[PDB]
Amino acid sequence: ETTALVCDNGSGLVKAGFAGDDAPRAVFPSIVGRPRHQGVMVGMGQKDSYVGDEAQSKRGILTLKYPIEHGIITNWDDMEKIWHHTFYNELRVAPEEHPTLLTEAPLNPKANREKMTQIMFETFNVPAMYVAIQAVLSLYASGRTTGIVLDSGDGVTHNVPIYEGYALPHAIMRLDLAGRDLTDYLMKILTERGYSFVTTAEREIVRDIKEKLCYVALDFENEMATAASSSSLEKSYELPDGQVITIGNERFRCPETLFQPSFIGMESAGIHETTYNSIMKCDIDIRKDLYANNVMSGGTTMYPGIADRMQKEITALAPSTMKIKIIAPPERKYSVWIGGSILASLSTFQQMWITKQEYDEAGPSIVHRKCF
Amino acid sequence: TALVCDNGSGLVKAGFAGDDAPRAVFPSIVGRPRHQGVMVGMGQKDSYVGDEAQSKRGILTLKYPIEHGIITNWDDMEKIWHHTFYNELRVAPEEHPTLLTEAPLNPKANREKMTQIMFETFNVPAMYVAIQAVLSLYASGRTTGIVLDSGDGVTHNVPIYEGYALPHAIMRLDLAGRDLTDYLMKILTERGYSFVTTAEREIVRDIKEKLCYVALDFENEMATAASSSSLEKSYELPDGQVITIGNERFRCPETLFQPSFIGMESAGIHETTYNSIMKCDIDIRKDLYANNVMSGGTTMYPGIADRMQKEITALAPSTMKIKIIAPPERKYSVWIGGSILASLSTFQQMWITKQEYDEAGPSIVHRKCF
Amino acid sequence: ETTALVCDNGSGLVKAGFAGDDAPRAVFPSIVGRPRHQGVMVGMGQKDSYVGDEAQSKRGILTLKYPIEHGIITNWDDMEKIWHHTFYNELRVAPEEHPTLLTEAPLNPKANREKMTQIMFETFNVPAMYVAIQAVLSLYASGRTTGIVLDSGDGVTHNVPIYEGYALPHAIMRLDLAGRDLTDYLMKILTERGYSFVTTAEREIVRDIKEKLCYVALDFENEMATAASSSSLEKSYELPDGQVITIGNERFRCPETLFQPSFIGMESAGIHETTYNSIMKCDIDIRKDLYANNVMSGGTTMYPGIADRMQKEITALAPSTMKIKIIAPPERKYSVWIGGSILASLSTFQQMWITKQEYDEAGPSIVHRKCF
Ligand SMILES: Nc1ncnc2c1ncn2[C@@H]1O[C@H](COP(=O)(O)OP(=O)(O)O)[C@@H](O)[C@H]1O
Ligand SMILES: Nc1ncnc2c1ncn2[C@@H]1O[C@H](COP(=O)(O)OP(=O)(O)O)[C@@H](O)[C@H]1O
Ligand SMILES: Nc1ncnc2c1ncn2[C@@H]1O[C@H](COP(=O)(O)OP(=O)(O)O)[C@@H](O)[C@H]1O
Ligand SMILES: [Mg+2]
Ligand SMILES: [Mg+2]
Ligand SMILES: [Mg+2]
């Protein structure tokens, strides 16, 4: 009778809702904003902190902080504020009568999961909770059991291969390059045309420009030559103060760091090379079934050129007698949450929760013996 | 309707007595999971038997219950027999007498535990145990001759005169297709290919079944392979990679004629056959030389009959006629001979029934059975 | 007076010197470093590549490559640079007056040995060269003639049984699990405490941590229990930037992969089981002398718990009436080189060289005729 809750706490967005539904009920940014200027009018309900869309609307007088960086919760009072906001104000529920399913990136610190368990059991005390891997939930939402998931969000980009319900944890790859790094690189290369975005409020403007105007080039050198020849690739964007800026090659130089990390000084290889190395680290008899089942999930995989570029690069890397298929659904921005809405709804899952009695018996160390 | 089951070291060939071909031919492997299961909307078993193992071997560790002809694991043999009776044949073992096969020169406790398991767990009205090379001679339409039975675990040379095997001339060589698969895995490291896992052992087995052959003259074949690339052949891996082998095609089966390639003390199959013939009386040696019968899958290399003819002609006296019979269906020849034997009229009183097992115990198979 | 050179080209280190000496004169890493950034100051040297210790000195601005992976040379131009820096910079000799002795792991590709012979004879042109197995040189240095040698370095762990100078080829076993895989596994499991190491320069730091702090437990489960029970097995290490890390139970989980290869996803058996299988593939009358003369060589056999653990495991596998003695010399990090100098200083080895005229007559295939 008790309805389970599915909460996906990424680095940039919080997607929370109920199990068994199709879409998340509450999608809001994971920001806590605090005032930085001098308040002069008395009273009028001035608050010392702002969470979510209220922090985004008043961001001209606020300093915005993200509690999670690179998939790791760095500030815990702000994370308590985020969880209190998504339980009492957005979802409008009482957490003492709802089990909770949370998500986590692979190769994370164990103390993050231990403190998530301790805070969910001692502050918002739940009957049950469970922490799950996001790529497994993406594979649940895809409707299949075999595939290699490339999940790229705001802090982490990770590859997880799964064959017939069995994961290969030695081939799991994690890269700390995601949409916030692309936002910072776009902020850096916007100064070549004279545009200066420095403050934490203007990072959101640069993120909006990246979401609206950036795309992935199929050929990088041909697109650079096309931009250098004619002004057919230039687009205009209107700033909130009415200013109009114009960008050319910076539309496709920004997500190219996903394929050339050396643009931001990283020594690692691209996401296509990471996916190929994750496939080639698996057993030989499963690789074919991986090659036809490349699944992309997350916001950073939402550029309108990325599936064709990934297919071209993997087809260049793979032998020619193999079929390479990139699976990009239109709902892949929320796919992890949809997997939670599947996984908490299964009758075979209800014995996998971590109850309060088990937490009192074992402490906050049962989350490693219970969750993978 | 009787049941004929050939439980080889590498394959299981089972069917009904009277049919001309086996109905269930599947690998004798048990696969178990190796990695961490993360999805709960799945069947999620713990043991896979047969082709279901071969369709899932990339996440599985494979085990053979039979090693070098003798049964090492009896729980896995129970699983093999259960899958044979209930999933591949769709029969009830309470209604059908079952014929079983056994390699010659084997420990007696293997037959003891075979009869005990077949009468206590998979209860049959009757059962019988037969020698494989005798059935392979029976399937070829003759009653006198020498059978070279080479399979997955053992190679045997059995001479049979007037339907009776001669036990003082039965020769056993502990070299068969599993050792050839492992030797091919060892010698593919020279060209840079690494095969370690039990799943890749099946890939190398497929390579051996597809590309290898027997050279007529080994030194001349090695000379021609080192002169030009006219013997190189290509194979496409399951992941799309292309490998090329030039002289491993004939070096791997040469262990049948030179067993020291894998470090075994015994002589080759030609000397083994000549020794098995030469232990017999002089008046039957002409019939044994004229009736050489090949059997099993390891005799399916496309050069083995001519090479065996050349070597036995070299060993034998020059006035002796050497004829080697290699039937095209010799991969299924123990089963066909068992089908012929189980469909005979007078064989029906040679069944070991359950009442005689109750009155005797797990030792009747050494008195009523051979 | 043409003294011979003994050069051991491992996967991680190069140990080179003169025959007759008791210690290698040049021990340096087998790396080539190339710049990953741009040079803004002019008037310097600024060479395009760095070999050996100079690559390790400025590894923060270089990406590092190993020309030898799992005992097999993959990059041959980098191996040209390594051998040139060995002959002309670390030894200061001209390799036209010294015959050379090289080492190779067993069950290697034939093209590696053919190309080594070719590059020795018409690039660094030598009067003579020989290629020898490493484990027989370890037994030559150990002073015995019968026994089974476990050589474990940076790329290949191999077991070779030798009876009265006869290497037994059908019981030689090879595993591609060595110290580099251990370094990668420690790099992976260091992310549980939050320590993230990504670049190729940080792999050297993790290798230094492994060399300083890791050890082999006698009983793994009791060690895990006492690590979880008390904070008495923790140790601290200082990074180059001054930060301090602490590891408690990663010290014995990292070399547990040598005994449980399933930690990195491999299906193979442990080194103790490989040793027992190598002994069981020998003749039945020589297994007593092989069980009494177990010799450990290489750098991965330098953990300070490995001899007692190997003794316990082999005594478990062996029959109860057998005597098991495992010999670990204190100088076993350089044991292939010492036996190589012993072999090259012998009077009856002077007919076993491959001369230049023989290479001219027979081409680069006489190394399969004159060398084992
Ligand atoms: N259409 C789009 N094009 C490019 N980037 C996008 C798009 N939509 C969202 N993003 C990026 O995705 C990132 C977060 O995606 P998501 O994975 O849904 O959140 P989280 O990482 O918090 O789970 C943001 O940094 C945002 O810039
Ligand atoms: N075309 C072929 N060429 C060479 N060997 C083969 C061929 N087909 C099958 N084999 C070998 O025959 C062996 C098994 O044959 P068979 O005797 O029918 O089974 P079992 O040995 O279990 O009785 C396998 O190990 C396989 O390697
Ligand atoms: N004291 C030690 N403890 C643990 N590992 C060590 C120790 N000393 C060396 N090693 C490891 O041994 C490896 C190389 O050893 P060695 O066999 O001497 O070189 P190579 O493998 O190049 O021949 C290095 O990767 C290093 O990590
Ligand atoms: Mg996310
Ligand atoms: Mg058979
Ligand atoms: Mg070495």
Could you tell me whether strands A294-297 and A235-238 are parallel, antiparallel, or unpaired per DSSP bridges?
A: unpaired
B98-102 and C166-167 beta bridge pairing: unpaired
Closest by Cα among B338, B301, B351, B342 to B13: B338
Question: What are the tokens at C113?
Answer: 């040995």
Q: Out of C191, C200, C264, whose CB is closest to A107?
A: C191
Nearest to C194 by CA among A72, B243, B200, B318: A72
Q: What is the CATH number of the domain that holds C49?
A: 2.30.36.70
- Is A100 in the same domain as A233? no
Q: What distance in angstroms lies between residue A209's CA and the mean position of ligand 4's atoms?
A: 20
Same domain, yes or no: C174 and C279 = yes
Resolution in A: 2.8
A109/C192 touch (CB, cutoff 8 Å), yes or no: yes
As a whole number of angstroms, the distance between CA A353 and CA A131 comes to: 9
Q: Counting beta carbons within 10 angstroms of the beta carbon of residue B166, is it exposed (0 to 12), middle (13 to 18) or buried (19 or more)?
A: middle
Pair (B9, B32) in one structural domain: no
Q: CA nearest B213: which of B265, B258, B250?
A: B250
**For residue B310, what is the domain's CATH number?**
3.30.420.40
Atom of ligand 2 nearest to the CA of B8: 22
Say whether C265 and A171 touch across the interface (CB within 8 A).
yes
Sequence-distant (6+) residues with CB within 8 A of A198 are: none
- At B157 the three-state DSSP class reads strand
Clarify whether residues B187 and B252 are in a common domain: yes
**Nearest of C56, C15, C8, C7 to residue C32 by alpha carbon:** C56
Q: Find where tokens 């114009």 sit.
A: A246
Q: How many CB pairs under 8 A join A and C?
A: 27
In ligand 2, the atom with minimum distance to the C-alpha of B180 is 27
Domain CATH for B264: 3.90.640.10
Token pair, residue A182, equals: 């692309």
Does residue B32 contact residue B22 with C-beta atoms inside 8 Å? Answer: no
In A, residues 254-293, which contact B (CB 8 Å cutoff)?
Answer: 282-288
Which residues, in sequence order, are CB contacts of C241 under 8 Å at separation 6+?
none
Torsion from C-alpha of A282, A283, A285, A286, nearest 10 degrees: -30
The C-alpha angle A22, A137, A310, rounded to 5 degrees, equals: 105
Q: Which two three-digit tokens encode residue B280?
A: 């017999």
Same structural domain, C214 and C290: no
Same domain, C207 and C252: yes
Q: In what order do the strands lie in the sheet with A13-18?
A: A26-29, A13-18, A5-9, A100-104, A128-133, A354-355
Q: Are strands B145-150 and B155-161 parallel, antiparallel or unpaired?
A: antiparallel
Buried b (16+ CB within 10 A) or exposed e, B312-349: bbebbeeeeebebbbbeebbbbbbbbbbbbbbeeeeee
Amino acid type, A257: T
* Alpha carbon of B343 to ligand 2 centroid (Å): 26
**Closest by Cα among C98, C127, C120, C114 to C356:** C127
- Taking CA atoms, C255 is separated from A158, C270, C273, in Å, by 27, 11, 15
Rounded to a whole number of angstroms, the distance from the CA of C39 to the nearest CA of chain A is: 14
Q: Are C15 and C341 a contacting pair, CB within 8 Å?
A: no
Half-sphere exposure of B312 (CA within 13 A, CB side): 29
Distances in Å between the Cα of B226 and the Cα atoms of B223, B248, B249, B261, C219 are 5, 12, 13, 20, 53
Give the DSSP letter of residue B188: T
CA B325 from centroid of its chain's CA atoms: 18
The closest alpha carbon to C291, from C300, C281, C279, C299, belongs to C279
Contact between B238 and A136 using a beta-carbon 8 Å cutoff: no
Displacement of CA C270 from its chain's centroid (Å): 18
Burial of B202 (0-12, 13-18, 19+ CB in 10 A): buried
| List of E strands, B142-290 | 145-150, 155-161, 164-165, 171-173, 233-236, 242-245
Give Cβ neighbours of residue C319 (< 8 Å, ≥ 6 apart): none
| HSE-CB for C117 with a 13 A CA cutoff | 25
Chain A contact present for C188, CB below 8 A? yes
Strands B292-295 and B324-325: parallel
Distance (Å, rounded) from C-alpha A25 to C-alpha B260?
A: 73
Q: Is B367 exposed, middle or buried (0-12, 13-18, 19+ CB in 10 A)?
A: exposed
CB C106 within 8 A of CB C161: no
Inter-axis angle of helices A76-85 and A110-122, nearest 10 = 50
Which other chains touch chain A, taking contact as 3+ CB pairs less than 8 Å apart? B, C
| Residue C327, φ and ψ in degrees, nearest 5 | -105, 120
Are C216 and C303 in contact, with CB atoms under 8 Å apart?
yes
Distance from CA of B219 to the nearest CA of C (A): 16
| C236: number of Cβ within 10 Å | 9
Distance CA A11, CA A73 (A): 9
Q: Answer whether B118's CB lies under 8 Å from B94's CB.
A: no
* CB distance B127 to B119 below 8 Å: yes
Contacts of A268 in chain C (CB under 8 A): 198
> Nearest CA to CA, how far is B49 from chain A (Å)?
16
- Cα B135 from Cα B296, distance rounded (Å): 12
Name the residue with tokens 């038997």.
B49
Closest by CA position to A290, among listed A152, A144, A95, A94: A144
Both C248 and C278 in a single domain? no
Sheet holding B30-33, edge to edge: B48-49, B30-33, B60-63
Longest distance between any two alpha carbons in chain A, whole Å: 73
Cα angle C4, C5, C9; round to 5? 150
- A24 is written with which tokens? 């998340």
User: Torsions phi, psi of C320, nearest 5?
Assistant: -70, -15
Four-point Cα dihedral B329, B334, B335, B339, nearest 10: 110
Same domain, C252 and C218: yes
User: Of C1, C317, C298, C283, nearest to C168 (Cα)?
Assistant: C283
> Are B316 and B285 in contact, with CB atoms under 8 Å apart?
no
Which of B294, C193, B60 lies closest to A286, judged by CA?
B60
| Three state DSSP letters for chain A | CCCCEEEEECCCEEEEEECCCCCCCEEEECCEEEECCCCCCCCCCCCCCEECHHHHHCHHHEEEECCEECCEECCHHHHHHHHHHHHHHHCCCCHHHCCEEEEECCCCCHHHHHHHHHHHHHCCCCCEEEEEEHHHHHHHHCCCCCEEEEEECCCCEEEEEEECCEECHHHCEEECCCHHHHHHHHHHHHHHCCCCCCCHHHHHHHHHHHHHHCCCCCCHHHHHHHHHHCCCCCEEEECCCCCEEEECCHHHHCHHHHCCHHHHCCCCCCHHHHHHHHHHCCCHHHHHHHHCCEEEECCCCCCCCHHHHHHHHHHHHCCCCCCCCEECCCCCCCHHHHHHHHHCCCCCCCCCCEEHHHHHHHCCCHHHHHCC
- B296 CA distance to ligand 5 centroid (A)? 6
- DSSP lists the bridge partners of residue C63 as C34
Which amino acid would we find at residue A175?
A: L
Last residue of a domain, one of A20, A51, A69: A69
State the DSSP H helix or E strand holding residue B357, giving kind and residue range, or none if neither: helix B354-360
CB contact under 8 A, A162 and B203: no
- Structural contact between residues B356 and B368, judged by C-beta atoms closer than 8 angstroms: yes
Q: Print burial letters for B18-55: b (CB count within 10 Å at least 16), e (below 16).
A: eeeebebbbbbbbbebbbeebbbeeeeeebbbbebbbe
Which residue from A211, A254, A332 has its CB within 8 A of the most atoms of ligand 1, so it is best to mutate?
A211
In chain C, the number of structural domains is 4
Cα dihedral B170, B173, B178, B184 sign: negative
Q: Is B144 helix (H, G, I), strand (E, B) or coil?
A: coil
Which of A253, A271, A289 is the endpoint of a domain?
A: A271
| Residue A244 near residue A236, CB atoms below 8 Å | yes
Q: How far is CA B234 from the centre of its chain?
A: 27
Q: Which residue do the tokens 């795309």 mark? A: A215
B39: nearest CB among A145, A286, A320: A145
Query: Hey, are the CB atoms on A109 and C191 less than 8 Å from each other?
Result: yes
- A242 Cβ contact list (under 8 Å, min separation 6): none
The approach used to solve this structure was: cryo-EM
State how far the Cα of C224 lies from the Cα of A112, in Å rounded to an integer. 22
The answer to whether B346 touches B163, Cβ cutoff 8 Å, is: no
Q: Which helix (H) or strand (E) holds B100?
A: strand B98-102
Q: How many whole angstroms separate alpha carbon A281 and alpha carbon A316?
A: 18
Which of B36, B40, B59 lies closest to A164 in CB terms? Answer: B59
Task: Verify that A204 and A241 share a domain, yes or no.
Answer: yes
With CB atoms and an 8 Å threshold, state whether B192 touches C72.
yes
B337 HSE (CA, 13 A, CB side)? 28
Closest Cα partner for A78 from A181, A99, A86?
A86
Residue C68 CA to residue C82 CA, distance in Å, equals: 11
Q: Is any Cβ of chain B less than 8 angstroms from the Cβ of A145?
A: yes
B158 three-state secondary structure: strand
Residue B11: HSE in the Cβ half-sphere, 13 Å Cα cutoff: 20
Q: SS3 letters for chain C?
A: CCCCEEEEECCCEEEEEECCCCCCCEEEECCEEEECCCCCCCCCCCCCCEECHHHHHCHHHEEEECCEECCEECCHHHHHHHHHHHHHHHCCCCCCCCCEEEEECCCCCHHHHHHHHHHHHHCCCCCEEEEEEHHHHHHHHHCCCCEEEEEECCCCEEEEEEECCEECHHHCEEECCCHHHHHHHHHHHHHHCCCCCCCHHHHHHHHHHHHHHCCCCCCHHHHHHHHHHCCCCCEEEECCCCCEEEECCHHHHCCCCCCCHHHHCCCCCCHHHHHHHHHHCCCCCCHHHHHHCEEEECHHHCCCCHHHHHHHHHHHHCCCCCCCCEECCCCHHHCHHHHHHHHHCCCCCCCCCEEHHHHHHHCCCCHHHHCC
Q: Judging by beta carbons within 10 Å of its beta carbon (0-12, 13-18, 19+), is residue A82 exposed, middle or buried?
A: buried
Q: Which residue has the tokens 């680290």?
A: A281
Q: Where are the beta strands (DSSP E) in B229-298?
A: 233-236, 242-245, 292-295
CA B348 to CA B360: how far, in whole Å? 20
- The encoded tokens of residue A239 equal 């700033």
Residue pair A247/A234 in contact (Cβ under 8 Å)? The answer is yes
Å from CA of B134 to ligand 5 middle: 12
How many Cα atoms are found within 13 Å in the side-chain-facing hemisphere of C252? 20
Concatenated DSSP letters of B3-16: EEEEE-SSEEEEEE
Q: CB of C69 within 8 A of CB of C155?
A: yes
What's the distance, CA A313 to chain centroid? 23
Last residue of a domain, one of A11, A43, A69: A69
| Residue A97 · residue A126 · CB < 8 Å | no
Q: Are A58 and A51 in contact (CB under 8 A)?
A: no
**DSSP code of residue B20:** S
Residues A154 and A13 in one domain: no
C24 and C92 fall within a common domain? yes
Residue range of the domain that includes C225: 183-271
Contact between chains at A167 and B58 (C-beta distance less than 8 A): no
Whether A147 and A292 map to the same domain: the answer is yes
